[PDB]
Amino acid sequence: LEKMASIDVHLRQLVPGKVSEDDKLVEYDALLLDRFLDILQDLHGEDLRETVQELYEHSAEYEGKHEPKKLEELGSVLTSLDPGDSIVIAKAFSHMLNLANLAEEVQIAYRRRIKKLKKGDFVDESSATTESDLEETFKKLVGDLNKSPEEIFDALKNQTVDLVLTAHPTQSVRRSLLQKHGRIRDCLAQLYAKDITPDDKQELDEALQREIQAAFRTDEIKRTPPTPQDEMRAGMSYFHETIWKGVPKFLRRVDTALKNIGIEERVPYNAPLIQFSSWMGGDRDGNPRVTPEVTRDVCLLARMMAATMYFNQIEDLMFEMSMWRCNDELRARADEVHANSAKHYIEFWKSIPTTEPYRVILGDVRDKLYHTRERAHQLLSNGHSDVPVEATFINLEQFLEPLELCYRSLCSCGDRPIADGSLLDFLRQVSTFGLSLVRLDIRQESDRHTDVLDAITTHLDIGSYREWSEERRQEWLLSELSGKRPLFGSDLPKTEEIADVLDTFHVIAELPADSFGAYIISMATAPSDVLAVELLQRECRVKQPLRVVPLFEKLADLEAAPAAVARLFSVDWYKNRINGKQEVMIGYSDSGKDAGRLSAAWQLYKAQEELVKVAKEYGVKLTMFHGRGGTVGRGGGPTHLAILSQPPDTINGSLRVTVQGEVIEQSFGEEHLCFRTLQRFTAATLEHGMRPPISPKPEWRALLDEMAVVATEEYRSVVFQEPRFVEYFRLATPELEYGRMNIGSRPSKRKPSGGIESLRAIPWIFAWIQTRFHLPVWLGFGSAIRHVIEKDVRNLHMLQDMYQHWPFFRVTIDLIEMVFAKGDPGIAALYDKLLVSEELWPFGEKLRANFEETKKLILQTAGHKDLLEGDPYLKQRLRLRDSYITTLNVCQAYTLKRIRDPSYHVTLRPHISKELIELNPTSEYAPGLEDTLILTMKGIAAGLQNTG
Amino acid sequence: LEKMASIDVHLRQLVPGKVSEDDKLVEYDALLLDRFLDILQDLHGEDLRETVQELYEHSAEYEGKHEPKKLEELGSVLTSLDPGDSIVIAKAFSHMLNLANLAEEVQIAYRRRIKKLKKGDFVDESSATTESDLEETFKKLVGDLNKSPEEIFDALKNQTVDLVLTAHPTQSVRRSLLQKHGRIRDCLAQLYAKDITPDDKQELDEALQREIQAAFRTDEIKRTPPTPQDEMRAGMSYFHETIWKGVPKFLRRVDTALKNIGIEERVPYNAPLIQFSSWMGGDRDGNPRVTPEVTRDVCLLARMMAATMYFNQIEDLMFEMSMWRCNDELRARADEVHANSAKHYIEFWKSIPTTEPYRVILGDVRDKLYHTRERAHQLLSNGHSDVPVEATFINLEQFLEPLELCYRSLCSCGDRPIADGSLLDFLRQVSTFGLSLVRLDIRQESDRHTDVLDAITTHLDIGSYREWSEERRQEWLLSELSGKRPLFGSDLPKTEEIADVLDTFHVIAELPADSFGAYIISMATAPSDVLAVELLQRECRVKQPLRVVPLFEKLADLEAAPAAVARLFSVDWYKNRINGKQEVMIGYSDSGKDAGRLSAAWQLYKAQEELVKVAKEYGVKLTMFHGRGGTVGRGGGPTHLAILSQPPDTINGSLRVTVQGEVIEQSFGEEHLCFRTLQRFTAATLEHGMRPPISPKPEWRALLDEMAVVATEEYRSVVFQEPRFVEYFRLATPELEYGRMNIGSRPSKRKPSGGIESLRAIPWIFAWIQTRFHLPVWLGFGSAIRHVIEKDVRNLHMLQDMYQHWPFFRVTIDLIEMVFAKGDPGIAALYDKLLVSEELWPFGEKLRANFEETKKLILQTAGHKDLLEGDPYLKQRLRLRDSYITTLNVCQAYTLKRIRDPSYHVTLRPHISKGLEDTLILTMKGIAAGLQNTG
């Protein structure tokens, strides 16, 4: 079995050099791959394994020299597979790619930071290898900017970093498989301890193989397209994985860094430097599976998970808190609590003596935590309870008060060190996670609210709120919000949709405010949308109404946004309701779908500038909420510079960002990855408040305005004006298959009969990610740079000045370059040849030329000859993934030709050893061609991760 | 604050060299001491801290040169302390000693093994630094002994090591402090990772200090002398600490070591190589606090703890077990289980689909585990339940069956590797811990059974079972055991004691058999005692009766033991009840109190010889149960050779050993320490089965016979014949204070008006441990070795040959030598000066000379010039503790003079910044914790 000698060779040819001296990535991937291939052989035979390995080697040769002969060879092998073998090959390559991502996480997580590799400017902040840690950022603020430590500490206490978890656009991988990935990562890591004993190393190898096989032998389909509650349970995995333990660890490190510049205090235990919000179960925009009851369910589930974790943690806290000397106040509380009926620690003590007052108070808190979980579970499972609300924690102050009493008391007695142990970690967890871990945002289209108001105004014979001009809408909305009469009752003709909207508001009213974040209006355009939501909130008896957040998606919505926000602040009722705080949401991907990526990036910079102008004019604290697709939505290092790049004063101590589902594993799956994530968010926020990026030279603005015009013209002329483009998009791309299959819970279009305008941005991105073409990300850049270069020979120099000195531009280009690295036009060509009509082939050809031209231009702009010349670590990891992804592409393409064309008979090969073909019985397509397709989609999706 | 610079120096003067190259012990201790003293200064002031540091510095100087002027300085300082400062100093030194123990454990656990330091013979097995690990033991068996790997594996399959956890003779430390010790150990260890980042090292230091203060700032008194359930709760901590996770780890290591000698199989997951038994809540011998309700409570609590640990463990198993391919049998069970009513994993899955059958069956197991804990809890807190016993696991087969089904199924599908992951660990945990973690032994005096039967026979107008000869007792007991008519009813006049015994049997009868181990007859002497327990068990309607274990204590009881056991095997009823398995208990400490330690050691060797002769004659698998005080009861390395030293075939694949309370933290507190404990017990047992120690040369046996005669003559002439001894023992020693104070739950004597015969062995040992004198351990060895040396010039050569070549002798001597290391006659002399009458001073003076002579003779026998010449690591660790313990000694002695004599006014010093009984208790617990185990 000298088979290993082959994969090593291929791997080392894929990543030739070393990206450092602790570069063990090729080693890691070889080890994992060898163990996996042996498992494949032991379960499905020597022939199956030899086939799979020949496929991998061919793919690696392709990602090396990009000879199309290699694609012809891969295809030749893959078409001759009957559905059984096709499923096993696709599954095989999905799992192999997963293992590659695992070795990547280990390598990243243990790479030694090179203090000599820092250049000294902001470019260092674009990679984890040279970015500033917390303390380095403190020293940067103090030295270069001559800020006093007191100013840094004060800035930090009032800072909030709000991470919003959203559902994954495809396979939000099951919590079980995450657990397995963890065990594999740990086995890998421990195998490379430079001090390990032979028997230890043996048992670790056997454990690694054992877990690789375990993960391979779990189905990844069947059952249901998981219900929204299931998707939410899966999203909450990272709290148990890393985040719960990770928050107090990060905060304590902040304490140390503050000590290391002379600050004697710690960050206050109730200060919300970290917050977590969730859309899982709250975003109903174009997702009818998300019902009112779904929202009630995920709210209660969250309250359960939080109470559970607090329950388990408070027992170790009770064991720690064995002191006797205490404050007079706490002694009073102990004697008071000692007057009662001790069920949840009979294994520990028959009862708790008054000589352990801390243990008394804490034991009572433990009792209240148990009753909160039991009552939430009864509310979820029935609808009523019998657990009195007076015996649980209903708001966060009830919970914090006894703990703060213990802390104060301990400090009174000079036991501050004891107080700063498990107790401090507990207080910080209560403050960060509250009673729910996450706060659920609600999201709905503006049109649904307009429908509701129109049904009401029709029911009152006042006219159609829909037909009303925006000024008439505003005037009516204002008179009603200021009025004393309720608006509607049960006697109201409600369509199924209008009933959905109102019932959602009623659910919101019947749940604790600690559970909710923001109500977000998709497709916001005018103040009447926000006012409409505010009115529906009031007239549905939502006692503590949510903050309303407009999501300005389209380009015209962005230009009109600051006018709208000004008009909203200028209204007396709204101005007093917001209490000096406004949060606006921007969607990088939505605006991209509208008007191309370059024009949307620049328009979003300008729109944030104007919104901060309005917020200062009227004295409101503006908070920008960054939706998916952004520069700040990337994974790892790049996030640091992306945040630093935001226009001055757009953050101001409140960062709200979407943690994309395709990135959450790379950012929170591992202990170090999580810590460094929280760190770069906190450090980037803190620094940007005090050290904004340079303001752009006026010529830079004028240039970007012109480029945006040309770029929008090209993007729209292709996507929207070319009549046959929609024909091409349906052939060269599996967009239709994505809409039909059990990959995401959402419909891909808002109106089934519409063109690209009615297509949601996620299937738009996804469709072109699968073919490694990435049109939605780069289309429009080519003609823009081409235009400015021809318009004046010297504009190229200006662009290069921007990339080297203007952060926003550098990060935008950098993102484009990263996406091009995940691109391969040759594969897009394979899809054309197999799936697209002949008279449409030149169309694709022209598109690919644009692809190529743009790439060259981006390179010229970035001053690079190769893609990602400045980040060889990422270039390496990407190349390693690409070798697996390419096979999944070819398999996807031929599987598509096989599905769409039953008149494409192929010379099948004999089946390859023991089955997986009988796990999808009720399939209308072939015995396992639907499953093969789903596998390649989940796989390519996992390999390409994030683009735009 | 350069005060730290002093203590380092003193420490380095205490242990001059390095016992290796990874010897960071002095560094560890210096760090812990510096951090602790800074804490003391921060809580009670610079004056208090400076006082404590002067005390330790002087103590270290004393342990250096042993100048009694150093003791005069210590005393002069400690007497001028009012009770408040006295308490803070005593508490302080107790915790300093604990920190010494913590660093000691870390040093031990991370000491790199030196393979070039092995000499090749059995002496290597007396220290962890050179003992054979599992794999080295295999290669020893295969190469030198020509045992085949098949033979090794079959031997292992059938082997059981049963470790019996007993209540602490003093302070069974609260589970909270065990946890804090864990955090201190972990912080210390990680600070010395040769890869640590500056901020990590900083936060680790702050966590270290924080935890030292946390442990120092908890009271250790008040409330009650904790209830038996409380002491039991504390004893069970080590399952959570290390043992639960640690057992599957060790078993997997066995599997690996087997692969490395060609065995492809794993040790069967249902093989009980490791077992845990408990006395906590079961030993009633001279201990009235242990009632029937206590036994029921610790039983139910135990089943609760186990049910919890299984419950928590099975959720990760459920996440791992996501396969879909399965056996036809398992698939049927999944569809079967899928026909039912899922409340305990709604945070995980709405429900478990039949596409995940393993998860289905396991989820059901999780459910049944939940109902089991809940039912046990309701029985404990109330007395009845409503949780159907059919909805719980009542016996181990119900529990194992679905799990074994999962394993079979996974193997059927070529998923054996997945099966050998979390699932195998789980099976091995069910088999090792069962439904109770531990199996409780019950223990009672034979005399109580005599009382009960005498009330019965008197109630039947047949006469007094007590006045009856032993043969008449036997004959009646046999007639009843072979008979079909019941013995007694509710109409039976029961004294509180007789009602107690019968009620204990009724509770055993009303609880699952899996909860209980062995019924132990203290002061057993004749077959009628065993038979008596058997009958009382039967006529109390105990469905599955316990195995009865006689404890032969006195020397005459040991001589008469094998005759008795032969007589029991010769009776048809007993022969048919035991089913070819017999367990006898021997008490090394018990027999020592009777007749001196040397004679008890030799008598126990010979007695085990005779017991094995008989057990082979009648074809029974004899299991010797080693009570407290043995060589095999030591901590760490020495246990290996002690086990190897037992007479051939006394073990025969079943070792039962007492884990003394004074050793359990050193043996299971840390992950590595626990593994190495389970390992050395498992390896030593396996080897001894196939490689029995040498048989003794007859001149050796004759010499030991003679030495035993002289030794008992001396021990008895001093302890029992000297008329003033009892007066001396009451003054030179805190025995009276121990009996009156809240140190142990047990009364120190069986009959208050008796002499030493009625004094229990534990207070006997403890009393002389407190004064660092240890008379119960070495007294009698002196006159024995002196006698044989004078009788013939060459007998010293014979003794040295025995020490160099007979393991039993080497381990006996070695234990004595270690005890002498923990002795200091000078401190005993201080106690004499303060607390003993003047006309009794030569008496003490004389005994101390005996001490010295005995020590000299022991050294000559072992071929040593200094004590513990062969184990410098232990010599070092002990030397380090001595400096704290000595301060605790001086404090105790002057506190005793102050307590007993209110006519001893002292010039107290002003109280030192932010009630003598509490001080005394502190010093006793402290000296107890520093001396750990002796004899």
Ligand SMILES: [Cl-]
């Ligand atoms: Cl109890």
Ligand SMILES: [Cl-]
């Ligand atoms: Cl649900």
